[PDB]
């Protein structure tokens, strides 16, 4: 048999850390930091009610696995003498005597965790002595599957076989104490990592080459340009399908996604290597896709890509769910096996999800993720509208609280997703209609009495972006931009006064038609393959070697100087990119009243009117009756100039195009971009330092910080092809021609904008981070991710700022 | 024979006074004042080298005229004993013994200046004793023909016939001392007169009656109205003759004076009684008069009127020349005798005139006043141009220094009379042409290089009167009032560039024609007898008795209250009083350029133009190219409204008349005056005090001071008959009609003027001075002008302010 056991119980619980200094409330520290406090924290578990059962269980595991597991075939083990002295003084010790009794008639040897060479004859009671004086158990760390601080104990000086074994480890890599940390991880956070990762002949310096730096720097610009071009063609290949769709035939956001699915793959195989099959599979995982693929097929195939994307999420706690992914995917050859194993594990997965408050609302989702084998991501998204909208609203609110600079975009996004039906895009709907009824339609999202005056999303975005930049013409926006059924459809008012559905009354299809026309033009006239082909990113030098200097904990670029010329060719923005937007404006012929209100019936002209009526006209004085004959023809000629048959569409056509709208050809180019602009990535003595993912990962890149990315936008010509007024029937023609004057003002302001907002020799500085990947997804900078010294913890908090394991002190 | 004479020489000289206190340098004091200083001043003559011959001459005159003139027929006079003791102590005395020896054999009596009853037989030496102790000779005054202080001496206590004769006068009324005063006159100046002239039963109170006061007060208003009406008809009877004269036929200022001569008489027989023949004779004393009358005929006939007018002149010294007028006119029955006596007296008159510096320049004038018997006043005036212009300039300069309030009228008068040829009006000339070439013609009165830019008299008067009241429209006056050949004929420029005498070039007859047309209209349409007949001065109460209260040195009106209603009827100021003045303005069709300069090319509009061009247009801001399309039609419509064929005459016709000038009838009434205004001469306890002429005169009036002369101008209606625009071809017609607006402005401003400048219930206070004359020029208030107590000296200086007969002390 084996030795007697008394308290072999081993179950226990983990611990957690407390905030210190003025650090964020979410503490996710790494190892070190509490270098001295680890012993003190382990002493608490060493001197509590859970201490001696854990110690006895560890002793039992040691005396079975390490003592008689290679034995007991010919040597029975007994423990006649065995005692412990774990006292209240937090000082532990032991004294064990082991007898090996052999019943076989032969000569054998004892295998013990030491260089022991002892010969024992048959029927002989071999002696074994394990002595431990009263001493403080030392603390060493272990790496849990979650990469958390699994505190373990070791003996300092204990005698085995009568000799002292210095630095004795009591079955390392696993202890029956379960004293983990919920907020402290094994490894080096962000900066203790940049002590053994860079240097003279250390990891980063010997794994990053000058030719590699040059090729990655060039490929950074090349891939940025390529993804920009693929994005531009994508909206321009899907936009063409959107626009060309016939009226009354629904075309969902995802049915068109298939028609450009490969492009997405290309796009996402250039943003991140290996992320090519995942997105092309994702946009095919819907009922509207031509070839449906299940969620399990989506997940098992590109498991590694999903792992990288999850590790790129900002939330640390996801890594806790990421520790079982490798165990989840072990021994699986097809998606059916993965589905079966997830069904097997559901009995433990779903209670953990339900018990977690953060994922408590998520509980239904994962539910059918284990209930139906034909799950589709986008079908789930369109079916679980409420929960997904809730998380999206929370995430967007957090982003607003974190990104005040893009507050308008987050505001319009939140207003969009305030409606559950906004998730009907990812389903069986009409995108060219859903985007119109979400972004260009009044909202009534309330139930108290009525808040239907909430207007549309585009109108609110214009109000935010034109807050106070323009004031007098704001009334114009009130009469032509804020009060048009093509941008503010006025929900629930169509069936209020007509109740007969006239052709003009139904503005839901006229606005959809205008949006389809705009999509047609942006698709096959502006962002077409032919029009986007004349934008060439040509290398200029691309020859200089990017020498690297290494000296102690540093890695610098000697002289980075690469320049790429983006030649815009002749990017003809044809008439129709802005002619369709003109057609979005109402075609109401009532131009006299609106212009009269804007010019004369205002807040400043009326004050001058009154002041000149009561008194004024300096030098004259006594001629006060002349005044209501002076500011009456001044208004009269201006009013009479306005053509009775011209709307704001025609006025804006005169202002922008010059010639009248009916006489302006849609094939002509409104704006032509010619020439080229330079990109001048440069720098001297630029530091190169490791760049990690959001969570703990074995894949690492490198970043060059302080790269002067000069975008010299000069040498480009943004020319208005129609720089002269060719109109024959101007809206405000006459001796007080204002449409021509407005057109000249527009041309001058366009030249000013292209001189200041456009080319200005932009100067930027940032960090070029490249996570370069090899051919078969064997990225050059991959760490051992095994020993607790290269396990980087990017989300951890650095001890340099100051963290202590105590309650606010 | 008579008594022996030793120093009968009597010739001597006068004296003069010296300034004292802070009195004006021209001292012309009256008697009294130097009440105590007269004795001291006479002592100087009593103790000088001229004393004893004067005393001896006085003694001789006394002993011939008063002693033996009624004797020597039977009583020879001898002076065996005779001595004087006029010592250096200024104490005079005498001792005389007279023997009367009769050679006739009869009994006679001696006639002496005393109650002496003595009987002397024949051949008897009658004795006479005249004793005088050493005593100071007292001083008494005498009245010279010039009414100056003729100091005379008297003896206090001397014994005649053995008895003392108290207050002995040594031949009064004449002394051989000739100690006159050049600055002190006998009598009471202005206020010592109002001590014996008013009182309880003294002169003014007993010579002024309540009915007399009432009738004179009523006649004051009646005569003021009558002279105003006669003046208005006079220019309107002479103006008609001026206007109706044919072109090229000269009509002098005096040839027309005859055609209205009687009116002048009427006028001047209402301004001052008896001044009716003088002015009617004066304006007939010229070569241009139909019936010439000599200066002697003009002077001898109305000698009394000339005396009153000369006594009304402000200069005191003229009275010295007035002392011989009565002696001049003694024993003369016709103008021939007066001419003969002036020729006789010329040998003394002309040296006195020449020796006097003030009349030294006058010497030629009086010269022919005694050289030709056919002298004419106006022929002399037009012949002695230089001297008369010199005195007129000096008098006008003095009036300017004395009357700053009417400085503009004196300035234009001085500018007029700066030319000698300005006196050609009173001769053989053309008034309708001379007044045009003097008042509406440029002046070049200088010889240095050129001052021809002096402009005309009317232009300078407008510049003075429109100094800074209007500024912006001043440029209009520069282009239409300051630069018109009808008001600024531009002398010496007509024969500069043309040299061919075109019809338009000769502006001397076109301007004369315009002036003649204006005279025609003011003569027979506005100031005609028919039009002036409808202005009636009606008494309202004229019944209340003006009771007078007398109490010591006072005379007050108990309650003066008279009111006269001047009913203006319908005084039709026809079209032509202002239509002719419109025709004076140039008829140049260039109205666009002048109005453009006045309105747009100014000093304030251009600044606003520039400010709005550089920046501005509040609320818009970025629209700066619109501005040179905004302030271009604002000007363009205003410029295009102005009719190309309309001049400033037409614009002013639209502004004033309404309807166009060609369609405005000259017989219509531009302004009609209707209703009536009240004159409310009133007051309680109003002082009545004597009022004298400028110089010493026996004719006196009385003045009521403090009369509240309320001219309640209310209840009159000055109506514009054309208060609505009836024009069919306005100068600035269109949608920016400004001629109609200008006309409405003119109508409103006319109503405002007639509400404030016109009727306002004017309140005035003054002194009603009446020099009432009886039927045969026997004015009621005439003083004895004989005794040295009623001889008023109005020009004298009152001793109350302080005057002493010493050099500045």
Residue numbers in the entry:
A (entry chain A), B (entry chain B): 60 to 868
The authors write:
Here, we report a comprehensive structural and functional analysis of the previously uncharacterized protein P116 (MPN_213). Single-particle cryo-electron microscopy of P116 reveals a homodimer presenting a previously unseen fold, forming a huge hydrophobic cavity, which is fully accessible to solvent. Lipidomics analysis shows that P116 specifically extracts lipids such as phosphatidylcholine, sphingomyelin and cholesterol. Each monomer consists of two distinct domains: the core domain (residues 246–867) and the amino-terminal domain (residues 60–245), situated distal to the dimer axis.
The core domain resembles a half-opened left hand, with four contiguous antiparallel pairs of amphipathic α-helices corresponding to the four fingers and the N-terminal domain corresponding to the thumb. The dimer interface, which corresponds to the wrist, is composed of helices with a conserved tryptophan residue (Trp681) that interacts tightly with the neighboring monomer. The palm of the hand includes a long and well-defined central α-helix, namely the bridge helix (residues 268–304), and a rigid β-sheet of five antiparallel strands that extends to the N-terminal domain. The core domain forms a large cavity that measures 62 Å from the proximal to the distal end and 38 Å from the anterior to the posterior side. The cavity has a volume of ~18,000 Å3. The cavity is completely hydrophobic but is fully accessible to the solvent. For the inner part of the P116 core domain, the cryoEM maps show prominent elongated densities (with a length of 10–19 Å and a width of 4 Å) that fill most of the hydrophobic areas. Instead, the mass excess of ~13 kDa, consistently measured by multiple angle light scattering (MALS) and mass spectrometry for P116 in different preparations, could be explained by the presence of ligand molecules bound to P116.
